[PDB]
Amino acid sequence: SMGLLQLLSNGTVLRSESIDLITQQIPFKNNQTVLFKDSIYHKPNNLHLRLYKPISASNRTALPVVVFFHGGGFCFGSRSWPHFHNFCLTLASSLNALVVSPDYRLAPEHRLPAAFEDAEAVLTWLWDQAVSDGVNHWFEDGTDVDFDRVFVVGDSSGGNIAHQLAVRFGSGSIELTPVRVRGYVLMGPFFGGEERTNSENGPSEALLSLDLLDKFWRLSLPNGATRDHHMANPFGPTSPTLESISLEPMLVIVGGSELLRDRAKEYAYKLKKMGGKRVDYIEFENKEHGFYSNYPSSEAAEQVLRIIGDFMNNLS
Amino acid sequence: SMGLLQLLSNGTVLRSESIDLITQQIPFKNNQTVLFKDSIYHKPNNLHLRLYKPISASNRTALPVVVFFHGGGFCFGSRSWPHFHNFCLTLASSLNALVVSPDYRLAPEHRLPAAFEDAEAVLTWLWDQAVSDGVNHWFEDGTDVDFDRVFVVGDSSGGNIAHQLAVRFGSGSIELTPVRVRGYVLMGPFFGGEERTNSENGPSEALLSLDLLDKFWRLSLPNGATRDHHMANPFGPTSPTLESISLEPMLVIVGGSELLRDRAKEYAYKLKKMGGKRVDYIEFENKEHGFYSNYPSSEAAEQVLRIIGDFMNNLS
């Protein structure tokens, strides 16, 4: 267990007998179809995104936009992975949204801030599309999109990416009218720090360990950097004062039993005291990293979707 | 994309707009609990397995045994991964079975036949347990297991492992009374060959590609070997004649659109003509590798479980 995949495949050992609640087969389940297609958003780096459209409400009303940024540790993952693809299927139909699911450059080959610059390129791409009526060539038929209703949803690495975007808009550095991101949703945000928090020193999860988190950062931050680099720690000797930045509504969703929990709560509560910041913090108890997407059938996964939808509906 | 994880994270590009059917939230879903624990089965190699027990029918009747061998390419994966853990949750409750979910040594560090020898060690472990009443210390409470009703379910690599076991029992080389494996279920069996089949030369899947399959074999077979090594190809210049081996009932389940489909059908139909071999072949159309576990909510996943249960019920 020295390489990432090896360490990931090393495995965790339950110290104790454990119980889980499983959902059984329902005979008359309900169906939606969802249309999906891939398009290159950044030709020099040959980066693709996938676009999703619920067929059902594409005839009903204009679709809000959810830019989903996948997880990993800035080191693995793809939109085309069934794990993430399936999550986006669920986002599209559950939220009734056009979903944008970009790939971004991964480390240790393309280290930070590649992902951050790629995430911007996605938004710029969206801007080009908005001001050129390219949504008609998005699919064989015609998509109606509300570019004034864009939301960024990030998992692990994507939650950091989301925060990176939230700062860049709030600082007034980037502006992409007619595109307006009305809200951010950081799910298990991948922040770091030289200092451990308590949760980080607490029990490993099924899959995430403190070793694995440090390995991600070692592979991802630029050479020489520490886990207090602003790109990892949003609040250390890090330039972002953020007390001046006007951030948009934000939702921090984390698992109760997860290593990142504490740093993600600190993040949330610091932003809440910086004022002018609608920042909710939601902790799902007994849940570890990725619960919403690892266990798509569970009460928690279903609840996460409803909360994000309510967050989005409140910003119209 | 030269390393495995990199190539896996490289991604696939839909050549075309595509549609998928998604299942929505049901408000009054049904629940089972399932108890699970980890135990080392092989101390020198510090290999763990996880044991699962549906709490519901542990008071009802003796539980059959399903040994689940996970996928990967003999190169990654763990029982503790939510992907596989969740599948086993589903196996346990859906089949009403004690499930045994072993880790095995992975390549390129421990190359074949490590997995095969580890799989045997799991069975031997089971034998020790059966003849020593260790099932009482399996969990805090008491488990009742039918060791005369053992079944081997393999995914990708585990399907090869399963076939490797099926030969070793059928050849009379290994015998573990009171344990009797009454059936094998190879799901997307990971066989290979220097020659491509048509499906192998056909379109990449979401995740599996022909490059990725060759990479698995390169990392997994012993140094110098070709994809026609018996450990990969069950029918080439490979010693197993198998026309003499008495194999037990077998079920080959594969996806219609998957690269391995053709080699897995050839396997099935060859065994059917070798006589004295109850070998069913089930192809799920429009489905790719791992459909049963990647898309746990789908009509196909649900159907796969029912077929395996019916196969198991027919051998009592």
UniProtKB/Swiss-Prot annotation, chains A, B:
The biological processes this protein is annotated with in GO are:
regulation of secondary shoot formation; strigolactone metabolic process
* Xref: Pfam families: Abhydrolase_3 (PF07859)
Q: Where in the cell is it found?
A: Nucleus; Cytoplasm, Cytosol
Deleted gene: phenotype: Normal shoot branching. Reduced hydrolysis of strigolactones (SLs).
Enzyme Commission no: 3.1.1.-
- Identify the residue span(s) of motif Involved in the stabilization of the negatively charged intermediate by the formation of the oxyanion hole: 70-72
Q: Which reaction does it catalyse?
A: (-)-2'-epi-GR24 + H2O = (-)-2'-epi-GR24 ABC-rings + 5-hydroxy-3-methylfuran-2(5H)-one; 5-deoxystrigol + H2O = 5-deoxystrigol ABC-rings + 5-hydroxy-3-methylfuran-2(5H)-one; orobanchol + H2O = orobanchol ABC-rings + 5-hydroxy-3-methylfuran-2(5H)-one
Reported induction: Up-regulated in root explants but down-regulated in shoot explants on callus-inducing medium (CIM) incubation.
Q: Which enzyme class, named as a word?
A: hydrolase
**Which residues does (-)-2'-epi-GR24 bind?**
G72, G73, S156, S157
Keyword Protein transport appears in the UniProt entry: no
**Keywords attached to this entry:** Cytoplasm, Hydrolase, Nucleus, Serine esterase
Query: What GO molecular functions are on record for this protein?
Result: carboxylesterase activity
Which catalytic residues are annotated? S156 (nucleophile), E258, H289
* Family of this protein: Belongs to the 'GDXG' lipolytic enzyme family.
Q: What does this protein do?
A: Binds to strigolactones (SLs) such as (-)-2'-epi-GR24(4DO), 5-deoxystrigol (5DS) and orobanchol, and catalyzes their hydrolysis; SL are phytohormones controlling shoot branching and communications between plants and microorganisms. Promotes shoot branching by dampening SL-inhibited axillary bud outgrowth.
Among PANTHER family, the record links this protein to: ARYLACETAMIDE DEACETYLASE (PTHR23024), CARBOXYLESTERASE 15-RELATED (PTHR23024:SF406)
- Supply the name of the protein: Strigolactones hydrolase CXE15
Q: Which organism is it from?
A: Arabidopsis thaliana (Mouse-ear cress)
Taxonomic classification, please?
Eukaryota, Viridiplantae, Streptophyta, Embryophyta, Tracheophyta
